[PDB]
């Protein structure tokens, strides 16, 4: 009934689009969501709406967007909220666009395992 | 002796640079780092050699420069590791250490979680 749809921005390397594929792994493994996909801003497959017709056509009415970037900014404000067509989805069916990372304490946690190369 | 040096992409929105600056002051509150400096990539100020020479010229030898991003990419191995002069300003007496990004840590899992749900 509802999906989580993670978006990232995408690479020419091939990073990015692990990372985004590791995540989604790691959150199937916890069953919280029926139906899990994930969508590239640039240069990669699969692409945003691409994602989310995946997601409709699974039987998904409440499409959760959650955006894995650090921050906002162009992509987070223009960008998505356009391919999302926010500002080819039915009646029936509600995107729900979510926050980013932001300056979660988590993330200074991760910062200082990196500090010492853990 | 040592600093950290948070490094960040940079944006012509505010936004990216308030996140580095509130990640630099939250790590200051931790007490682990004698100094920690931030610098972003692109557009905006200090830049990633100011971030360096100001955390040199309050004493520091060893420059653990973490990058700020989530993933690898063309900034991560190719930008930063330049403007480190890390590939092709720096003293001898000084080492540069250079960090990993975040990377799909199971911290960044729980954190889209919480997303997920608007917390």
């Known amino acids: 009934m509802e999906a989580l749809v993670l978006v990232g921005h995408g690479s020419r390397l091939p990073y990015s689009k692990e990372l985004l594929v590791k995540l989604a792994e790691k959150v199937k493994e916890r069953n919280l969501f029926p139906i899990v996909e994930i969508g590239l801003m640039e240069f990669s497959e699969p692409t945003i709406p691409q994602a989310v017709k995946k997601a409709i056509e699974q039987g998904a009415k409440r499409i959760i967007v959650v955006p894995v970037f650090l921050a906002h900014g162009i992509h987070t404000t223009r960008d998505i909220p356009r391919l999302l067509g926010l500002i080819e989805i039915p009646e029936d ?5 979510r926050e980013p990372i932001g300056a979660d304490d988590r993330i ?8 010492f190369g853990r």
């Open 108 to 115: 200074v946690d991760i910062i200082i395992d990196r500090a």
């Open 93 to 97: 069916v509600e995107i729900i666009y």
